[PDB]
Amino acid sequence: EKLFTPLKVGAVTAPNRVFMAPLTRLRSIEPGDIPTPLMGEYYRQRASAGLIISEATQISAQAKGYAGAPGLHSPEQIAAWKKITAGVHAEDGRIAVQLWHTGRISHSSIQPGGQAPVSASALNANTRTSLRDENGNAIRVDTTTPRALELDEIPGIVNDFRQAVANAREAGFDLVELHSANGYLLHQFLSPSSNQRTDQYGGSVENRARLVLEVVDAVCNEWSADRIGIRVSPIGTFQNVDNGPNEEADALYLIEELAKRGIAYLHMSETDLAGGKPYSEAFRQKVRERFHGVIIGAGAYTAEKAEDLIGKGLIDAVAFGRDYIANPDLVARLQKKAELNPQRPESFYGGGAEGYTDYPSL
Numbered sequence: 001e002k003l004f005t006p007l008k009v010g011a012v013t014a015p016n017r018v019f020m021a022p023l024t025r026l027r028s029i030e031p032g033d034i035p036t037p038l039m040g041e042y043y044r045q046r047a048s049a050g051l052i053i054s055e056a057t058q059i060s061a062q063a064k065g066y067a068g069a070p071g072l073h074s075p076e077q078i079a080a081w082k083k084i085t086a087g088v089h090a091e092d093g094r095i096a097v098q099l100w101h102t103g104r105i106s107h108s109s110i111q112p113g114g115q116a117p118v119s120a121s122a123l124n125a126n127t128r129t130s131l132r133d134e135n136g137n138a139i140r141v142d143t144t145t146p147r148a149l150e151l152d153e154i155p156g157i158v159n160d161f162r163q164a165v166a167n168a169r170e171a172g173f174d175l176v177e178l179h180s181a182n183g184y185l186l187h188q189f190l191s192p193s194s195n196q197r198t199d200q201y202g203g204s205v206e207n208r209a210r211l212v213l214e215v216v217d218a219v220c221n222e223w224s225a226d227r228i229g230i231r232v233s234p235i236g237t238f239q240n241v242d243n244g245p246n247e248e249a250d251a252l253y254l255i256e257e258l259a260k261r262g263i264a265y266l267h268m269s270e271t272d273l274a275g276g277k278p279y280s281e282a283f284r285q286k287v288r289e290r291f292h293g294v295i296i297g298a299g300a301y302t303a304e305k306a307e308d309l310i311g312k313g314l315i316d317a318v319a320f321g322r323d324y325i326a327n328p329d330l331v332a333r334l335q336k337k338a339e340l341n342p343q344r345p346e347s348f349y350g351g352g353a354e355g356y357t358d359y360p361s362l
């Protein structure tokens with residue numbers, strides 16, 4: 001059981017490999033997109049995780065694509081997050097903030113100015129996002145067709161990432177995780193199916209990776225490389241974003257580029273919740289040879305598959321999403337091979353304490 005053994009993740013040391021996956025729960029205060037003491041308690045309950053990766057958190061207001069998702073750009077968000085990180089720390093936890101821009105998985109109604117969300121190109125995501133109705137309840141809404149970012153707008157995106165990482169530092173997060181996966185902004189640049197640009201941010205894989213690597217460089221400069229992790233979903237299809245006809249070659253390009261930055265970790269979202277073809281161990285090996293930091297795998301993992309792959313030297317840690325939702329003490333439960341609380345998927349998004357902080361510990 002390597003699952004319950006320590007792991008150096010950049011600037012911190014996880015005491016086990018059972019990580020809490022970033023889990024959008026859509027419980028933040030609006031207006032302001034502000035983390036709550038309730039979220040503080042949910043994270044504190046889960047403070048035994050080897051590492052908590054927070055719900056995806058906006059780098060900027062423009063980054064917002066979901067109602068109830070928190071930001072890390074405003075003083076009030078920073079103040080609220082400070083309490084939440086202090087709570088995790090009070091329990092001897094560690095927490096990374098996952099930082100995103102949702103790009104075209106967004107809706108004009110929650111964009112600054114009610115304007116179209118931005119992306120690499122002006123192509124609809126053809127999916128839904130989650131807004132809130134007038135009662136504050138989660139509802140699914142078709143995504144708004146995005147605007148193609150202008151060349152001159154790119155440095156601002158980079159700077160939003162850089163600023164959010166400076167904010168994360170101040171807020172007491174131990175690490176940050178760049179959300180370059182699952183069909184979101186960075187992923188929309190990466191993918192040829194969502195990126196049809198003909199400037200230096202589109203076409204070739206080098207151009208498609210350009211933004212994410214600029215982002216990585218700016219955030220490493222801002223804080224420190226050993227504070228920076230990144231989530232990718234470079235193989236398969238995620239909320240309609242395929243990785244193109246050269247997905248494997250392009251991933252490996254991207255991974256080798258990330259490697260040069262000496263970043264804390266590479267987190268792989270391997271499949272959508274609807275599933276997809278598993279990663280081949282061959283691919284896993286190719287990833288592992290290109291990247292020299294922590295590799296976290298995620299996507300319908302069982303303790304048994306995590307042990308398997310960590311034991312096989314292919315990944316360092318596993319991020320559990322839905323089991324962590326349902327089991328605050330997942331670490332102790334996996335450790336003791338205890339039964340797990342039943343999941344209540346109906347309360348994954350939005351709502352309050354119920355299905356959030358009422359899953360019991362052993």
Ligand SMILES: Cc1cc2nc3c(=O)[nH]c(=O)nc-3n(C[C@H](O)[C@H](O)[C@H](O)COP(=O)(O)O)c2cc1C
Binds near residue numbers: 022025054
């Ligand atoms: C309720 C829900 C919310 C999610 N929110 C995020 C998100 O914030 N950022 C992200 O990268 N992945 C998100 N994911 C995907 C998870 O991080 C994770 O990769 C997936 O849930 C792991 O699979 P598992 O639930 O079978 O363990 C979410 C998944 C679910 C079920």
